[PDB]
Design a protein around this ligand. Structure first.
Ligand SMILES: [Mg+2]
Ligand SMILES: [Mg+2]
Ligand SMILES: [Mg+2]
Ligand SMILES: [Mg+2]
Ligand SMILES: [Mg+2]
Ligand SMILES: [Mg+2]
Ligand SMILES: [Mg+2]
Ligand SMILES: [Mg+2]
Ligand SMILES: [Mg+2]
Ligand SMILES: [Mg+2]
Ligand SMILES: [Mg+2]
Ligand SMILES: [Mg+2]
Ligand SMILES: [Mg+2]
Ligand SMILES: [Mg+2]
Ligand SMILES: [Mg+2]
Ligand SMILES: [Mg+2]
Ligand SMILES: [Mg+2]
Ligand SMILES: [Mg+2]
Ligand SMILES: [Mg+2]
Ligand SMILES: [Mg+2]
Ligand SMILES: [Mg+2]
Ligand SMILES: [Mg+2]
Ligand SMILES: [Mg+2]
Ligand SMILES: [Mg+2]
Ligand SMILES: [Mg+2]
Ligand SMILES: [Mg+2]
Ligand SMILES: [Mg+2]
Ligand SMILES: [Mg+2]
Ligand SMILES: [Mg+2]
Ligand SMILES: [Mg+2]
Ligand SMILES: [Mg+2]
Ligand SMILES: [Mg+2]
Ligand SMILES: [Mg+2]
Ligand SMILES: [Mg+2]
Ligand SMILES: [Mg+2]
Ligand SMILES: [Mg+2]
Ligand SMILES: [Mg+2]
Ligand SMILES: [Mg+2]
Ligand SMILES: [Mg+2]
Ligand SMILES: [Zn+2]
Ligand SMILES: [Zn+2]
Lengths: 91, 154, 110, 114, 69
RNA sequence: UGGUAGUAGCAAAUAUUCAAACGAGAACUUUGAAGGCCGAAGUGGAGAAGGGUUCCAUGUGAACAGCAGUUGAACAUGGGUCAGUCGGUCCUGAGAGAUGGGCGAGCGCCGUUCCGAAGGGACGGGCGAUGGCCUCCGUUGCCCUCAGCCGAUCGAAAGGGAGUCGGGUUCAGAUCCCCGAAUCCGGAGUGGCGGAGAUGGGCGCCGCGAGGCGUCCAGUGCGGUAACGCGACCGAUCCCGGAGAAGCCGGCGGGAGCCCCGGGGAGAGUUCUCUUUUCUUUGUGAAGGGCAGGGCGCCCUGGAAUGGGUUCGCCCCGAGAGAGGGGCCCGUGCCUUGGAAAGCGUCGCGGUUCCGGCGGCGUCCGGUGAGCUCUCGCUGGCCCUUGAAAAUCCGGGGGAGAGGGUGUAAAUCUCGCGCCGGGCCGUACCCAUAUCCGCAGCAGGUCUCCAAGGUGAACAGCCUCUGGCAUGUUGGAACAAUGUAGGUAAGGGAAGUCGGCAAGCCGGAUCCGUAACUUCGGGAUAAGGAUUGGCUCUAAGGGCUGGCAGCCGACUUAGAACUGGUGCGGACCAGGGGAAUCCGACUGUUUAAUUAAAACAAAGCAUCGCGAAGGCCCGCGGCGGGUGUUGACGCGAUGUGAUUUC
RNA sequence: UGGGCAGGGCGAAGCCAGAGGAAACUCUGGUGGAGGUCCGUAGCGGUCCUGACGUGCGAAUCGGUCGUCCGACCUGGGUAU
């Protein structure tokens, strides 16, 4: 029984804050609350302990990441760029 | 009261039998149990902090040190980073493009943590109500309920 | 005995008088304990127990007697289906062993 | 129904001022103040959230009166580190040294070829 | 307090210097011997009546014996 | 000092009546009876702040308690507060504040680690002196050697903080006094004792053997595959770790206390009729030992799809799931020591009195509950909020060192006992419609703990139990107007009035139904309907034992019949509704004492400054200070104000 | 640095079962209790009667009716300006 049709987790805010604000917060709330797959254990048990801090339920390993996502586009792009820079510099 | 996470890294003191503990600005991609190398000879990867004079141009660093021995004062906010554009072996100075858009010349002996500061994208999520704002600013300082000047008396 | 409990002498909602969550958890406990009693007595196998456990969680059977009657009819139809399969498999084995014996008899001749 | 009062001048339901009900031999319900529940010591591994076993979980200052055998366990790093991390450290300490020996042997072969 | 289950250990406890007094309490279906020491009031619980009076006769003479009731 | 004037008034919170006693005198004191209230968020019982003798007994009724008083919180006489365990004392939080330093004409100010020679300590070794059986050790005096710390010091009677409970006793004090059981800390030449470190193996011999002599060797424990256990089981400077030490909220389960039901007893109420009836009571401390009961992100065997285990929800599983076997923590629950001696309820004797007086008995068996409170445990949700330090204690890595050469063994013991001590300050009472602050016995204000039965969703309102009180600074006699506080009113239904001000209407629950619009979440209890009592039935919703049988236990929902003067959420509790305009998104805050709003604020939006020798700002002064434990996703300075369009 | 906040209404994510479909996925019945959510006590505040009083209980109180009542919530003590 699909309870709503457009609003999802953001429905807890009721008829407040405006539609555009609610739809903009909804995607980030989904991202920050959905559990992700840990790259160290494989279990989908990554939860946002605090702002920018992600924790593994089973691995019990803490990973610094984005405020609302496990890893941002800037972070992964920088990581790839630094890896290539190290390869180019050290041959 | 800080938008960026901290990482407690423990080193072994080379001059006496003890384990020093320090707090660095966390760069996303780092995790507990990871070996972080600090020094001139440390290789270029996310997490390590090495002087600017060694890293090549175009690199991305955080917790930039304004002066040699300053312990890091530049580019240490969530999601912010500094790009190294060019070097100058004579006078040992390197130009760095700060996140505000200005480029500053910096001595090539101070260190910088490689990578971007974790916790980025915080501004993307809109604060939704006075409750979020009140809790955001109560931790930092009493500056939130700003009354506009025109509403005041002369 | 049922007196002094009509619609007139009720000021709270039916949820307040008897919470839905408590009624649901009473039913869940009763059905699940009945299911594991059947499982430990071997009246049902592990796979049927799991499927019934999920279907109970899905709010299919409202009463214990309805649940056990559903179990009884499932066991009856499954047992007959097993009987038909066993007869067919036995007949197939008879045919296969018959041709194998004929083949080995011909080989013994040759 | 017997209603009872505090037996101390502290009249606030703070953490330290927590009581329980006990019936006296005089057929009377009297408040009895109970110490805060102790916790078992945590391992030094830093990864395992389960508290150590075999150690009395009492208030920290109570450990003075306890005997030695009731505070630790008969193991290396016993009473301050779980056996899981202990055996992992033992295996890691052995393996790292073995690889260091292998590396030194490879360096010796490299110098011999050099 | 402590409950002594044997008899010879109770005799040693009674003969100990710390024993200031011993009292005998005989109730229905049980006889108790309470010996007061500096820290503990040890109690011996028995049901054999003739063995109990044998015990009270074998008590050391230097201990203050006090029958109850 | 007069008129006012013997006037205004002595009207907030339902209420008193009768008989007796003391007394000279009684609507007001006391007793007894009756009728009432507060109704367990109290008019009850106890605290913190505050007050300081208001607490207790006797006497007086001069003055006060707005009447009076035989009464007092009034007056005069004398008492009353007993602690190693209850707190302060100890630690530190936000902060405050000296020394160094700097400034200042100057009293002094800034500053709290900064422009400091900031250690009065020590394992151990050496020199020298003293005492005791000068053995060995202790106190030292000197030297070598080792040593980080974060700043002297203050800062909580709600933060951390080891350790006392039960009964009894007074006119007034009881975790303090008496009795009985304990516990923590400190101390110790000869350790006061026991136990551990412990006493074994090899060889040569004697003896029939058991067993006994002489040589070497080992001996800072032992057990189980394991979680780990056993009664101890050496150990420094150093290092690491833990506990102390953590937010709010939801659900669930376990355990206590209270409540409920069926009984046995004991004592009281009714008995014109009935009621194997109704009301009270029916227990065991702290600290140990044992066993239930919960929790484990603890381990061993073995390895799974045809996927499995499982909660109310979840969740978990080749990084090892189900099935067995174990291990650990809490064990506030039950039994036992304590402990029936004591306590309690009854019946009977005594002291004719002064009595922890003496006596008999009983202090019993059971069952359930989305019941309420407390506590424990598990899990989950929320944060652009992440939810405290220190004192103190413990464990672990290390072997610097010590102990004896085979015994009268030793060094060393966090094991069972033994011996002594624990200093100083507060401890009464009030705690609030009369012990506090408001000029007062002032309807104002003042921080918390304990919370029964019925109705009922309910800690709502009403009635009652335990407990307390006399109607709130007076009584009597009438019931005029005008008032204050409640109502009722034929017919019309806002025609009154600036204005439906006020009053009035609906109102709970169950079964139906619910529009314009919209940001799709709402509007919504929209609007509009019907039923509701009492009694008697029926159907359905489970456990325990041995698709079946028996025995139990609870609350509900639906349906039906009968019936009452159509009364039935019968008291209390308890939303009027709709159609549009303007302003403000909303939640929130605002002129204490005339304006609660359209005002302010807020998330959103848009600008400006600043890369630290910097922007904003403070400061008389200083290498001053706040932002800053900060670095452009930051800080500071502005405007506008949800969303959509511009 | 501590303490405190009855009982109900609406029903967000997440999850289960069934039905439909080629898939994407779509529907129905459940569990779940999130919300600077609603009615409403305690508490906090004071809209209206411009009621009562207005030489008062009171140099700002009293009655009914009232707003909010899980958070920008209320409150004690310590401390700073
Ligand atoms: Mg402010
Ligand atoms: Mg103005
Ligand atoms: Mg529901
Ligand atoms: Mg305290
Ligand atoms: Mg142990
Ligand atoms: Mg008059
Ligand atoms: Mg009056
Ligand atoms: Mg009192
Ligand atoms: Mg008095
Ligand atoms: Mg008078
Ligand atoms: Mg004492
Ligand atoms: Mg100063
Ligand atoms: Mg102090
Ligand atoms: Mg304290
Ligand atoms: Mg008890
Ligand atoms: Mg298993
Ligand atoms: Mg008795
Ligand atoms: Mg060692
Ligand atoms: Mg007192
Ligand atoms: Mg009181
Ligand atoms: Mg006063
Ligand atoms: Mg009256
Ligand atoms: Mg009167
Ligand atoms: Mg009065
Ligand atoms: Mg009329
Ligand atoms: Mg009429
Ligand atoms: Mg008109
Ligand atoms: Mg009105
Ligand atoms: Mg409407
Ligand atoms: Mg218009
Ligand atoms: Mg508004
Ligand atoms: Mg204000
Ligand atoms: Mg005003
Ligand atoms: Mg007003
Ligand atoms: Mg502007
Ligand atoms: Mg609300
Ligand atoms: Mg008025
Ligand atoms: Mg007047
Ligand atoms: Mg509301
Ligand atoms: Zn993982
Ligand atoms: Zn571990």
């Amino acid at each position: 029984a699909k309870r709503t049709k457009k609003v999802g987790i953001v429905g807890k805010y009721g008829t407040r804050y405006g539609a555009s604000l609610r739809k903009m917060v909804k995607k980030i709330e989904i991202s920050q609350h959905a559990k992700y797959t840990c790259s160290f254990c494989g279990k989908t048990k990554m939860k946002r302990r605090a702002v920018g801090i992600w924790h593994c339920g089973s691995c019990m390993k803490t990973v610094a990441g984005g405020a609302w996502t496990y890893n941002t586009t800037s972070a992964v792009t920088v990581k790839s760029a630094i890896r290539r820079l190290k390869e180019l510099k050290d041959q | 009261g800080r938008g960026a996470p901290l990482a407690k890294v423990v080193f072994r003191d080379p001059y006496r039998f003890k384990k020093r503990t320090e707090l660095f600005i966390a760069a996303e991609g780092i995790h507990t149990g990871q070996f972080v190398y600090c020094g001139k000879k440390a290789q270029l990867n996310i997490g390590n902090v090495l002087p600017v004079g060694t890293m090549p141009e175009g690199t991305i660093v955080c917790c930039l040190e304004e002066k040699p021995g300053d312990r890091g004062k530049l580019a240490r906010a969530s999601g912010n980073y500094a790009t190294v554009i060019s070097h100058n072996p004579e006078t040992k100075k390197t130009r760095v493009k700060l996140p505000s858009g200005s480029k500053k010349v910096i001595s090539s002996a101070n260190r910088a943590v490689v990578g971007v500061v974790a916790g980025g994208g915080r501004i993307d999520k809109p604060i939704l109500k006075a409750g979020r704002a009140y809790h955001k600013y109560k931790a930092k300082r009493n500056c939130w309920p700003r009354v506009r000047g025109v509403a005041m008396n002369p | 005995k049922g007196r002094h409990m009509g619609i007139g002498k009720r000021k709270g909602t039916a949820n307040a008088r008897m919470p839905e969550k408590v009624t649901w958890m009473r039913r869940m406990r009763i059905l699940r304990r009945l299911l594991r009693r059947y499982r430990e007595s071997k009246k049902i196998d592990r796979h049927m127990y799991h499927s019934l456990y999920l279907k109970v969680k899905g709010n299919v059977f409202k009463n214990k007697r309805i649940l056990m009657e559903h179990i009884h009819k499932l066991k009856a139809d499954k047992a007959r289906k097993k009987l038909l399969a066993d007869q067919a498999e036995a007949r197939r084995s008879k045919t296969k062993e018959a041709r194998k014996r004929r083949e080995e008899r011909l080989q013994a001749k040759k | 129904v017997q209603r009872l009062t505090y037996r101390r001048r502290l009249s606030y339901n703070t953490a330290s001022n927590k009581t329980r009900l006990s019936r006296t031999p005089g057929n009377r319900i009297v408040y009895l103040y109970t110490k805060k529940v102790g916790k078992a010591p945590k391992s030094a591994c830093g990864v395992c959230p389960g508290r150590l076993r075999g150690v009395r979980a009492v208030r920290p200052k109570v450990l003075m009166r306890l005997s030695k055998t009731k505070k630790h366990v008969s193991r290396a790093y016993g009473g301050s580190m779980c056996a899981k991390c202990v055996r992992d450290r033992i295996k890691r300490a052995f393996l790292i040294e073995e690889q260091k020996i292998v590396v030194k042997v490879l360096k010796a072969q490299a110098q011999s070829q050099k | 307090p402590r409950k002594i289950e044997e008899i010879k250990d109770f005799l040693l406890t009674a003969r100990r210097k710390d024993a200031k007094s011993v009292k005998i309490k005989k109730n229905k279906d049980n006889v108790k011997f309470k010996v007061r020491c500096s820290r503990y009031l040890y109690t011996l619980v028995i049901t054999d009546k003739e063995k109990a009076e044998k015990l009270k006769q074998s008590l050391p003479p230097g201990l203050a014996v006090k029958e109850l009731k």
